[PDB]
Structures are given as structure tokens and as C-alpha cells.
Amino acid sequence: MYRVFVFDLDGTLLNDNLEISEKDRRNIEKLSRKCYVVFASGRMLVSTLNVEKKYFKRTFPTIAYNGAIVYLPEEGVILNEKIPPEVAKDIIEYIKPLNVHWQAYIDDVLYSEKDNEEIKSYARHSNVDYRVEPNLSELVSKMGTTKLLLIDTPERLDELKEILSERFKDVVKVFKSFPTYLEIVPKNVDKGKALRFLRERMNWKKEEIVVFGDNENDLFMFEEAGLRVAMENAIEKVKEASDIVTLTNNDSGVSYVLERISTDCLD
Ligand SMILES: [Mg+2]
Incomplete structure (x- = not known):
């Protein structure tokens, strides 16, 4: 039974x-x-x-x-x-100069650096509430995150996937969830x-x-x-x-x- x-x-x-x-x-x-x-x-x-x-x-x-x-x-x-605040900090400092649209899952809350159309449509389709936090880099770098997500055209996202995987494949998991969504999660x-x-x-x-x-x-x-x-x-x-x-x-x-x-x- x-x-x-x-x-x-x-x-x-x-x-x-x-x-x-x-x-x-x-x-x-x-x-x-x-x-x-x-x-x-x-x-x-x-x-x-x-x-x-x-x-x-x-x-x-x-x-x-x-x-x-x-x-x-x-x-x-x-x-x-979660992603250790260290590898997390390294990933964020690496990704920012690349001017991308990233969001972070921290303590069960979705945060986004900028309130753009990318985030609006993602929260809509995967129906969840999000909050805009321009200082997200500090929030994550000091609080840790369950996961990071990048949103871009299937084109540039395929490229971002490539470099982030090669660079962080060893301490984190990086994969496309969909054509316009790139996810980084605990190993x-x-x-x-x-x-x-x-x-x-x-x-x-x-x-x-x-x-x-x-x-x-x-x-x-x-x-x-x-x-x-x-x-x-x-x-x-x-x-x-x-x-x-x-x-x-x-x-x-x-x-x-x-x-x-x-x-x-x-x-
Ligand atoms: Mg299922």
C-alpha cells in the first residue's frame, strides 16, 4: 500500500x-x-x-x-x-559591465534592477509579483539568491548563455528555460x-x-x-x-x- x-x-x-x-x-x-x-x-x-x-x-x-x-x-x-554570496557576487560583477537585464530571487521575492518591458512580460507570463530595486547588486551580494535570470532576445541570450556557462559552469548551473529566459541556479x-x-x-x-x-x-x-x-x-x-x-x-x-x-x- x-x-x-x-x-x-x-x-x-x-x-x-x-x-x-x-x-x-x-x-x-x-x-x-x-x-x-x-x-x-x-x-x-x-x-x-x-x-x-x-x-x-x-x-x-x-x-x-x-x-x-x-x-x-x-x-x-x-x-x-542558494547561490553562495561569493559566486553570486562574482557573477553579478562579471555580468553588469555587459549591460544586460537581470533579476534576482531573494528570500522568495523577485527583484529587478530596472522596471522595463522585459520584466513586465516575464512576471505576466510566469505570473508572479516583482519589485524594482536599483541597488539589487548590494541586496544579492550580501543576502544571497536562490537564482538569477537574464532576459534578452533569443539572439543575444544565446551568446550570454555561452560565456556565462564557460565561465561559471564549475560552480553554478546555467541554462535557457525558454528562448528569452536564461537561468542561473545552484549547482x-x-x-x-x-x-x-x-x-x-x-x-x-x-x-x-x-x-x-x-x-x-x-x-x-x-x-x-x-x-x-x-x-x-x-x-x-x-x-x-x-x-x-x-x-x-x-x-x-x-x-x-x-x-x-x-x-x-x-x-
Ligand atoms: Mg511540470
């Missing part, structure tokens, strides 16, 4: 309109009684906890920033991976390491854990679970590593399999 249920949000529990169907909501509600529910997302911690409170008036053990943050409703953040952090950490903390055993995913990012969690469910919309690689491929996230792919799994709770 299974007693721990891990769900990615985007492309999984959330449909393409970023909402959770009533069917999936009700099934989670039933499990949450007596059993453990875990949400794992690449989104900010606040954004993730907000979805939790919106559909369920509470919070659950949570994996945010794709593994950098592990949160427990009672303890709060018990894992907080070896991912959803799998975060889930394994949570497991050690909570004393979960792999055999009682189920994970639902659709991502390359979620593939890491699969190694830490006893049962693996890929969404029908998952990339080919994820489906081939799963045990079962349920319906799409636009339907209630989660419920479709969730209702058939051998589980404690619900008696």
Missing part, C-alpha cells in the same frame, strides 16, 4: 489553464486525511503555497524552486539551497535530491511513495518512488521510465490512476 503522494503542479495536477479540476481536488482532500500529500514545483515557494491554500485551506510538505526549497507546514523551510539541486532529503527527514520508505510527473525535472523524483505515473502529455522519456501512463493533465489524469491505487487512509 501507498501512504505518500507526490504531485508536480504544471503539466500534472494543474491543467493547461493552471487550475485543478474538482475531481482531482476532492481525491487529494480524501487522501490528505491520515495520509501524506507532497507538492513539487519549479515555481516560487509562495506561488506553490498559494495554490495549496486556494484549493485546500492549508499547506503541505512542499518542494519548490525545482528542489532548492523543501518546506514543512510545521517546521517551515528545512532545506534552502547540483533537483526535485529528486529534495524528495530524497524529505524522505530521510520524514522517515518515508520508497515502497509507500507514488509520484506523478510529466517533466525532465520530475524524472529525478522517479528514482525515489515505489510507483511511477507519467501524464499522457509527458515527454517520451518520462513515459518510458514510468510504470503507468494516465490521462492528460487537462482531464483529470491524476484522479484516473489515483482512484485505483492500493492505499491506506480512506480505510
